[PDB]
Amino acid sequence: VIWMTQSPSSLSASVGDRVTITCQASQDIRFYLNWYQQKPGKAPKLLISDASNMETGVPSRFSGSGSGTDFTFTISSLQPEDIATYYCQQYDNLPFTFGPGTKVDFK
Amino acid sequence: QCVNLRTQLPPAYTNSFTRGVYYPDKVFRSSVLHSTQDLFLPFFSNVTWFHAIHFDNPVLPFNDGVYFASTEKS
Amino acid sequence: QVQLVQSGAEVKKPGASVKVSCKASGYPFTSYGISWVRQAPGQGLEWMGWISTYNGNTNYAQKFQGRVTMTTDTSTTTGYMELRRLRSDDTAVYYCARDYTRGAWFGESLIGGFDNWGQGTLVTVS
Amino acid sequence: EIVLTQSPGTLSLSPGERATLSCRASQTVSSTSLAWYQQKPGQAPRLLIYGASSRATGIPDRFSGSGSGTDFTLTISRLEPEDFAVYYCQQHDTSLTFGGGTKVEI
Amino acid sequence: IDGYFKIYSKHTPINLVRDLPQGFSALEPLVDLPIGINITRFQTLLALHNSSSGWTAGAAAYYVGYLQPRTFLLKYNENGTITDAVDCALDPLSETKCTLKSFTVEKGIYQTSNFRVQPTESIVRFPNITNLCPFGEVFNATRFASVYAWNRKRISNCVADYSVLYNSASFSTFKCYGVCPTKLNDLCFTNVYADSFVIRGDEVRQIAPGQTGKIADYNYKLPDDFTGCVIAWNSNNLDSKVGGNYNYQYRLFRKSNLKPFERDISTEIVEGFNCYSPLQSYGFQPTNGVGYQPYRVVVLSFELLHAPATVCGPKKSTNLVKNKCVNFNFNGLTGTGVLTESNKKFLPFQQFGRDIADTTDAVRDPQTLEILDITPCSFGGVSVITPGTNTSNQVAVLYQGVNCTEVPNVFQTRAGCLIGAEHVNNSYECDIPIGAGICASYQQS
Amino acid sequence: LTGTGVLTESNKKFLPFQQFGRDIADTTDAVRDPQTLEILDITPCSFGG
Amino acid sequence: NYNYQYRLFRKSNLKPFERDISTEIVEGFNCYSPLQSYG
Amino acid sequence: EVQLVESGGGVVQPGGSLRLSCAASGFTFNSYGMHWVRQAPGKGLEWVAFIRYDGGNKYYADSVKGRFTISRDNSKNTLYLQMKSLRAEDTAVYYCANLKDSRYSGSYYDYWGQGTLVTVS
Ligand SMILES: *[C@@H]1O[C@H](CO)[C@@H](O)[C@H](O)[C@H]1NC(C)=O
Ligand SMILES: *[C@@H]1O[C@H](CO)[C@@H](O)[C@H](O)[C@H]1NC(C)=O
Ligand SMILES: *[C@@H]1O[C@H](CO)[C@@H](O)[C@H](O)[C@H]1NC(C)=O
Ligand SMILES: *[C@@H]1O[C@H](CO)[C@@H](O)[C@H](O)[C@H]1NC(C)=O
Ligand SMILES: *[C@@H]1O[C@H](CO)[C@@H](O)[C@H](O)[C@H]1NC(C)=O
Ligand SMILES: *[C@@H]1O[C@H](CO)[C@@H](O)[C@H](O)[C@H]1NC(C)=O
Ligand SMILES: *[C@@H]1O[C@H](CO)[C@@H](O)[C@H](O)[C@H]1NC(C)=O
Ligand SMILES: *[C@@H]1O[C@H](CO)[C@@H](O)[C@H](O)[C@H]1NC(C)=O
Ligand SMILES: *[C@@H]1O[C@H](CO)[C@@H](O)[C@H](O)[C@H]1NC(C)=O
Ligand SMILES: *[C@@H]1O[C@H](CO)[C@@H](O)[C@H](O)[C@H]1NC(C)=O
């Protein structure tokens, strides 16, 4: 079992601000990490796969990077619609695991 | 080089019947019944039918191997 | 991680007695015994004794023979030490530590020392 | 009981300097039954070395030591601001005793 | 396959406009490339051209299927070409064809296979022991005993995680007899005995079953049926002294050899001509060669008695499931079967029962101390009842010796559960015999 | 592929990917010659009681 | 000749003819570089 | 277009059992593997089990291993989860999903269902 952690647990920011989220794996998972976004009452949505591969339909303000055990997620210009909790998933080895998640609130 | 090219179309299925059989090895045999174990397309299975031009050509899973067939003159 | 927690400071009269607890967590209680030392103000370490958490067996420094007793509680994973017949010279900070110098089952000497020390309990006699 | 004597009483050293602290037993002590400790002002003591060949958990590699017979040594390859403290030697070959202590200060 | 990317192909004319043909043919090998990569996704590449509508192409279509592990019966003709095939997993009739190695089957009843009920849940049960075994207390001791006077300690009423010793790099040898060290964590024992001493490197070779020599014969011996592990490591930095650590000794002389686990510390011979002291000291020094340096040895012997185990590896006890097919493990006693409350009047000293087949059919639960009965999960033969393939492809299936309620035109007979046959209240001459006065025929159904 | 027997020209219609044939006894009864690429039949030398 | 090294740590064992040259563990308590040089 | 619909949720007691299902439509279900993921109220995501497209291999999390079984029916395009020996900790919203995975599922797309609530009390 590969454990995932995230930092910060939560943050707040205003419109136009730059927001970053850090994820870390207990094991080298190469670039095999998915970034999910979730809002209350809804299922998770995939924004990024394979660490840095942006999904079709995802706004250009979103990006991802990192490798090995250290991964990051960035929003270049936060919008009112970007207030959500983001989760990291590793899929290098079964069973798959999710991180604790990082919440972005509104300042 | 690359061109920045719209909607996936509904799925469709046909019957594989007894197609997808191949020679499991390169050893010559004749006038004989031989039992073999390998990866084959199951008989009478549901096969997915795609049309590139009814326009796209979606990325598919490879799974454990793929049977592919295409009927055309073009 | 492994921690030990002792009681708060106390002030006693001569002839009285003081009891200091040592609550353990982070490890199997019966795997390691609990050692006790004290330090007078500005002085070095004086060994008082040691108790086995497994079988309750005790060993003491000769200086404290008849003065210091010990007991353990496995259900609360806590060790205790009591010093009786207090004198003015017993003003000191008392410490507990996880022991790896003596076996708790066989009583034989081991290759190790006192670790995971408590915060220390100050006792004053006047 | 075996009495342990430490020397020198106090070292006076700048940050970045190397330090050596000695301990002599009144009787022969096996290396397997000896340990070294460190203590800061107002704080409980900690184990640094046990068996004279093995450092305790959380102890920096700059800490080492050796010895035989009655004479054992604790060394610090380079002093940090956090190393200017009081050190003790201990043995449990016979009963269990601690030395008088030695200090390193600026 | 194992990095090899294999392609087979065939190219023929087709009379259909927009579908795959109903018929049979085989594909031939095209190419086999030693690529050595993983493939999980694929995409098809088409040729496009630039028209008034933008990038486009003529009509194009294709079919995609996936392969699965299957057994086939292939028929090669006189010219060595595959002309027919049977998918042995398609239906009961195809299974019959494959069983009989034929594409044609005659009227009758054939047994093709067997069925078995699988376990739906797993359980684990161990004694409620909370203490950990004092292995470090033995291995991390300041001093070890002399070989002529080897020490013994008993380990009991504790949990033993053997991976702490097995995976340790501190040991030069870890030789187990009768048991695999990697499986020790799944076993329970009544007791474990730890013997310890100091010897020379070259003498470590004598610490085993079926050995002879100064140590094996006069100091320490293991039995031929020994079960346990011999662990040893270099202690030159601890047990050696300048001038010779003659505090360590061994027995050099005796009138007879010792028995397994025997010890003799007699000091009887004054010395003189043909008269010598029985003990000889070791010249253990830090400057000795590798084979002449001291080594510490610990031998762990395993004891098994008809009694509640007191030494078990790491445990993960679960609840107890009854009246269902389950996997189980009672203090190392693994197996598969249905567990129920027993009506067997066990006496207090009895932990389990046995049959004449040398199998356990009842156990005492280590925590509740109740008696459970053990039975096998349902199984039986499967037969296919068929008209000739020259008459019909319709078949009926008989599950032998089972209730129809356990199987998932369903008729229960003494022969088993018959499915696919239509029962009637008429009577005829027997065609295909089933048993117990029951026959079947093709009347169509 | 060593052995003893009589070698003759084969009438077996081998496909280009096939190097040899096998019987039900798990023996080779035809091979493709590594230099001429022709197919040869293999039979045992005469024997009897 | 510390130019020659070997793998000292991994989370799981390798399969036959497998190779792994990853350098993932910063170092610290219970955190170590996977490779060890030869003396 | 692409739908995943969980159902079979309800309220049960500890030591009992419950069977969930997920209907699939709009895509070639029989070509893809499937995952179960559950989420308690106010908590993060917990991976439960994975099954291959052919219904061959099955994988479970340690938290459910030995108690839960994953299965599927490619003729009815339906994914199933059979849960036995339920505990209070199993209270969560259970989702079926086709998770994008370049190593295992082989899927190039990522889909989630509505989720169904299971309560154990
Ligand atoms: C293709 O279009 C996408 C927007 O759909 C854009 O983000 C991308 O940069 C374009 N690529 C090129 C080479 O123009
Ligand atoms: C093919 O798919 C249909 C549903 O469209 C299903 O009813 C039928 O049983 C399937 N046949 C096979 C062999 O899977
Ligand atoms: C290829 O797949 C195997 C599993 O079958 C995996 O162990 C191996 O690491 C994969 N290779 C790469 C480069 O990911
Ligand atoms: C295809 O047509 C578009 C629009 O006329 C044009 O921009 C593009 O360059 C053309 N490409 C080629 C190869 O003709
Ligand atoms: C084998 O091939 C020959 C032609 O070379 C043909 O006449 C004969 O009928 C074929 N035999 C079979 C069983 O197809
Ligand atoms: C397990 O605990 C029960 C009491 O709950 C006790 O009666 C039983 O003897 C224990 N089992 C063992 C092996 O001690
Ligand atoms: C012996 O002590 C060392 C610490 O010096 C520890 O790492 C090791 O696990 C101990 N051995 C056993 C069997 O406990
Ligand atoms: C098989 O059926 C045909 C009629 O279709 C019949 O002429 C032939 O004799 C039958 N064979 C046997 C063995 O009954
Ligand atoms: C099983 O079959 C027997 C008759 O052979 C019948 O008496 C019994 O009640 C059946 N059991 C069930 C559960 O129907
Ligand atoms: C046969 O008779 C029984 C009554 O004994 C009746 O229940 C059953 O339906 C009848 N079956 C047929 C095919 O007539």
Author numbering:
A (entry chain C): 1 to 107
B (entry chain K): 14 to 18, 21 to 69, 79 to 98
C (entry chain A): 1 to 126
D (entry chain D): 1 to 106
E (entry chain K): 197 to 465, 476 to 614, 634 to 668, 683 to 684
F (entry chain E): 539 to 587
G (entry chain E): 441 to 465, 476 to 489
H (entry chain B): 1 to 121
Q: From the publication, what sentences describe this entry?
A:
Kimura et al. and Acevedo et al. also considered other variants, including Gamma, and found that Lambda exhibited the least neutralization sensitivity among all those studied, and Kimura et al. found that Lambda was more infectious than the other variants due to its T76I and L452Q mutations. At the time it emerged, many studies indeed predicted higher resistance to RBD bnAbs, infectivity, and higher likelihood to escape vaccines in the Lambda variant compared to contemporary variants.
ELISA experiments confirmed that Lambda escapes three of a panel of 12 RBD-targeting antibodies.
